[PDB]
A paper describes a structure:
The crystal asymmetric unit contains four superimposable N-MabR molecules with a mean root-mean-square deviation (rmsd) of 1.8 Å, calculated over approximately 140 aligned Cα atoms. The segment spanning Ser83 to Leu105 appeared highly disordered in the crystal and could only be modeled as a coil in each chain. The N-MabR structure consists of a bundle of four long α-helices (α2, α4, α5, and α6) and two shorter α-helices (α1 and α3). The helix α2 (residues Asp24-Arg48) is kinked by approximately 60° at residue Ser34. The dimeric interface is formed by the last two antiparallel helices, α5 and α6, burying a surface area of over 1000 Å2. This interface is primarily stabilized by hydrophobic contacts and salt bridges, with 37 % of the interfacing residues being charged and 33 % hydrophobic. N-MabR was identified as a globin fold using the Dali server, an unexpected result given the lack of sequence similarity to any structure of PDB. The absence of residues for heme/Fe chelation, along with the closest structural similarity to nonheme globin sensors, suggests that N-MabR likely functions as a nonheme globin sensor. N-MabR adopts a “truncated’ 2/2 globin fold, a simplified version of the classical 3-on-3 α-helical sandwich, characterized by a 2-on-2 α-helical sandwich of the helix pairs B/E and G/H. Helix F, typically involved in closing the heme/ligand-binding pocket, was not observed in the N-MabR crystal structure, possibly due to the structure being in an apo form. In contrast, N-MabR elutes as a dimer with an apparent weight of 47 kDa.
MabR (Rv2242), a PucR-type transcription factor, plays a crucial role in regulating mycolic acid biosynthesis in Mycobacterium tuberculosis. Regulation of the fas-II operon is mediated by Rv2242, the gene product located immediately upstream of the operon promoter. The MabR structure integrates three distinct structural modules: a non-heme globin, a GGDEF-like domain, and an HTH motif. In summary, only MabR-type proteins are characterized by the unique combination of a globin fold, GGDEF-like domain, and HTH motif, and this specific protein architecture is largely restricted to Actinomycetia bacteria, with few exceptions.
Numbering used by the authors:
A (entry chain A), B (entry chain A): 14 to 159
Write the structure that this text describes.
Amino acid sequence: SPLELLDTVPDSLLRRLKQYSGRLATEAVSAMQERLPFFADLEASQRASVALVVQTAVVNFVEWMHDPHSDVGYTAQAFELVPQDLTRRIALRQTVDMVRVTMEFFEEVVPLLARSEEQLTALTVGILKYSRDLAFTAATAYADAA
Amino acid sequence: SPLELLDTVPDSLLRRLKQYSGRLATEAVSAMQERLPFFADLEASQRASVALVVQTAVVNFVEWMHDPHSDVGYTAQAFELVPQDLTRRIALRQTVDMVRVTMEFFEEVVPLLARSEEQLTALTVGILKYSRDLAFTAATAYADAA
């Protein structure tokens, strides 16, 4: 089962992932700069903050992989946009575009840490499940706020 | 690569999937009735229309699996809510809840048609990728309308 696939992923790899989280987040933001026109227009301060959020997401993913409990995690950090709701009016579409590019980026990269096909498949399934599951929880959070 | 995994899925299985689409859509709606309290409160007409939409989604998934072109498909049917925008004011949250339950249901079921682990993994990856990719395109469509 695809669940049994997840179980096969060493803490080794997960530990490694959290270790490299900040690098990945920087690379993700670079990919955003390339793929999203408006992203290059953002302030360096804002770009940095986004990258922080990406980094936290990476860490949360890693925790989820350990216990997909989705309740043990209990780590829904929210300090994004604390300075300002839609800080500098970041546009709904743009934020979606950013989330997309982020998830696409991780779909491309995270499997590569795997050391074996089994682990590779595990990681591809894990990231895809998380990405979706996360986007769902985000969408519900936006519905709640509406 | 997870892409090579998709290539391994016979038209046999995909053809079968589209054939069973309406049954699946009915089963999905049953699962929605069970998991979503407000869904039981919907009119039989509306429930039926939802199931139609689910059915179309199934078919679109199958097409996507053949060519993940995402442009050849060119099949973004929209007659949902033609009678009424948010027909009978269906609530943003509720629609998200429905999409979630639908995708969860398909994540659970669609892999089972596979006849081999390779195909099973392919299907799990395929559905998870599609579900996410679809939810993204939906979210952008909602951002555009805002």
